[PDB]
């Protein structure tokens with residue numbers, strides 16, 4: 001009672017939110033939000049310290065970040081460093097943390113029973129941390145792994161490069177991540193004891209007055225109140241003033257500047273940026289959001305629509321962008337066609353024409369009202385969140401908003417402020433602009449290099465004559481304000497649960513044309529529904545050409561519908577449409593109210609679609625580059641790709657796809673579409689706020705619309721063929737090797753094929769994966785430091801399964817091979833030793849994870865959709881498999897390992913894909929390994945092997 005400075009009033013929440021909330025401020029300055037949820041499976045807490053990278057000392061880049069790794073390694077009360085991770089591990093929890101420019105955010109979840117035990121261990125790091133010196137070298141090699149990861153990633157490159165072109169004296173120029181150089185090599189050379197500087201930064205910065213704590217649990221508001229007072233009232237208050245960065249990092253000499261940048265992927269982008277004051281304080285009227293909505297609009301009369309008609313760009317992003325406390329940015333970013341790259345000046349002229357139009361028209365209240373209405377709807381009917389993300393998010397926002405507004409924060413707009421809009425719009429002018437062009441056409445034409453990532457670039461002043469041209473922009477008649485959004489939902493009725501409602505989806509239609517699975521939502525009760533459709537056609541993947549045409553068809557369909565569908569997206573109604581190895585996939589999600597109207601427009605357009613030649617050529621070129629850009633993908637990404645190609649009956653390569661792409665002409669595509677839609681089978685899942693009858697009426701409308709416009713007829717059952725997995729021979733080991741030409745890291749996937757999926761085989765494999773899961777990370781990543789990516793787990797495809805390992809390392813593939821096999825023996829011993837008690841803990845951990853309950857509709861739909869697309873239809877799977885899992889013995893697992901997985905197992909089926917680093921040449925004891933058969937030709941490999949059956953569906 002005396003340890004609490006004040007209690008907040010009522011925490012404004014949605015009427016639909018049954019969780020209970022209480023805000024308060026501790027006497028030591030800590031802001032608190034408590035969340036009482038008696039139904040939650042997992043409890044969670046989070047602490048956000050309003051200090052991060054921008055506050056690093058200039059001579060030690062990455063220190064805030066480093067302190068984040070170092071802070072959770074042993075305290076006075078809990079000496080052992082593994083304690084926090086261990087306790088969470090033992091009680092179905094997890095933890096994680098992040099460091100930004102102004103924040104360091106620590107969070108965990110745990111089983112609802114063990115909140116106090118977890119929060120106790122958590123609270124100590126903010127009372128008496130030890131920072132065990134033993135780990136220092138490991139945590140530095142960790143931070144170094146992260147940076148090295150991002151080095152070849154174009155987005156991180158652009159992020160840091162922008163920083164390098166501003167005022168070098170401004171904290172905004174800092175390198176926030178750090179690496180081995182900034183945390184070991186340089187501070188050694190300069191005679192810096194990192195540890196005492198770490199400790200110093202902590203002492204100066206980790207003040208309760210800059211801390212926010214969030215706790216979500218089953219316990220009451222009063223019990224949580226007591227617990228948080230008990231644990232956090234002792235955090236020391238050092239009255240640290242909150243860092244402000246009110247000088248803008250781009251000053252007059254950083255303006256009217258042009259940057260020409262070389263990317264890693266063949267991408268072509270234009271970035272237009274305007275320095276603006278910090279708008280955070282105007283949050284109740286949010287004038288940048290207003291301008292972002294309009295400048296970034298995609299409906300008719302939009303900036304984008306005109307840039308698209310002109311053939312200059314495909315996509316556009318607009319609006320306000322965070323900086324830090326004191327400074328912000330307004331951006332207009334576009335991608336560029338080949339013609340766009342030659343008309344950058346004209347593109348920018350058009351941007352200023354639209355900006356000028358918003359001036360001449362002045363502010364519109366009806367637009368603001370629309371935004372207000374949509375945000376109110378969005379807040380009211382917001383999906384429930386996983387507790388871990390929820391607490392972490394709130395902890396951050398506690399630093400920006402009054403207690404009572406912490407949930408409504410990002411949602412609610414109140415007052416229309418025309419003056420403010422006009423103020424922001426006044427900064428959007430040629431004299432305040434910064435321009436960046438990203439293009440490979442600048443390769444070898446650049447004089448500068450960014451130190452952290454190696455990025456190559458050029459800088460030049462924009463000529464005055466250009467600025468003046470932009471300043472003098474006429475009004476353009478192609479630009480118009482949007483009209484009223486007719487997709488705004490108004491019917492939020494939750495339909496009564498039907499008498500014959502089912503717990504799982506039921507087959508409510510089974511015809512030549514369609515299989516329809518349906519479940520009325522009996523859990524979330526929001527006015528939404530998810531409508532998923534799989535369209536099956538043999539002509540979508542028959543050869544590389546057809547697969548190309550499938551892709552382009554749907555890309556052009558989406559491009560054509562975009563103006564119309566954008567309004568619906570703004571109104572919380574969205575769709576996904578993509579091609580598959582079997583046909584097409586369509587998903588429509590969100591508010592059910594106008595859902596049938598959007599669906600019908602899509603099905604109609606699919607069938608009566610008229611192609612724009614100009615768009616066809618542009619989209620085709622963009623797709624070519626997309627196929628090429630896979631070369632720039634990560635090595636482990638490549639490894640996984642190669643293995644799918646290897647193990648699946650039919651699969652066209654990126655090389656085959658691009659080779660066929662030149663044969664896609666407009667007349668060939670126009671012929672393809674009616675052919676594709678001539679014969680179909682549809683399998684659908686309709687899940688949400690809908691009745692059995694409504695479901696049937698939706699399916700009927702989809703069928704009738706295709707039948708009418710495309711003359712669709714059903715496929716033959718014998719035509720509904722799924723692809724099989726390659727059956728590897730007993731005691732075989734095959735290796736496929738390739739090189740990544742971009743990254744100087746290796747990638748590898750090792751796949752131990754087991755058998756066809758079945759209740760028993762599934763649980764043998766999953767328990768084994770459960771057992772080795774933590775050890776694999778601890779040994780291969782933590783101890784041996786093999787690389788950033790270390791993964792093990794079950795692999796499932798085409799009714800078949802096995803065990804896999806994926807690793808990205810500096811070390812050569814064959815080396816990684818011996819270490820994995822070495823690890824596999826370690827676990828062999830380890831299972832023999834392990835106590836019956838420790839074994840049963842593994843079973844319990846697996847069970848809990850498997851029975852994890854979806855917290856939103858989509859997460860429930862996805863589980864159902866999984867069963868539908870695998871054609872196993874096992875909706876009660878979890879319960880059944882857990883029940884079985886519980887009957888398994890330690891022997892069972894030993895037997896299984898010995899028959900299928902052990903180096904000398906009689907039924908070992910091993911396939912490895914090795915992807916070599918850009919430069920690369922073509923401890924527990926590791927066992928002796930046989931000579932692998934090396935795959936030269938994927939077709940030959942496949943021809944020489946049998947193909948598995950397909951799994952019998954659960955009926």
Ligand SMILES: CC(C)(C)OC(=O)NC[C@@H](Cc1cnc2ccccc2c1)c1cc(F)ccc1F
Nearest residue numbers: 155156158159161162165259271273331333436
């Ligand atoms: C958004 C991320 C990727 C984090 O990057 C940035 O914050 N800034 C880099 C920024 C792109 C950008 C712009 N102007 C520059 C001027 C000079 C030098 C580099 C620049 C980079 C960017 C903006 C954006 F909205 C989306 C992607 C982006 F890469």
Ligand SMILES: [Zn+2]
Nearest residue numbers: 065069143146
């Ligand atoms: Zn890190």
